[PDB]
Amino acid sequence: RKCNFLCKLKEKLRTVITSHIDKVLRPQG
Structure with missing residues (x-):
């Protein structure tokens, strides 16, 4: 929660903030 998908x-794939929720498969990649 901050901005959007x-x-x-x-x-998608990043670290923590942009690797927070995800579809479920791979937030950090």
């Missing part, structure tokens, strides 16, 4: 919601 691919940011701090439905993540």
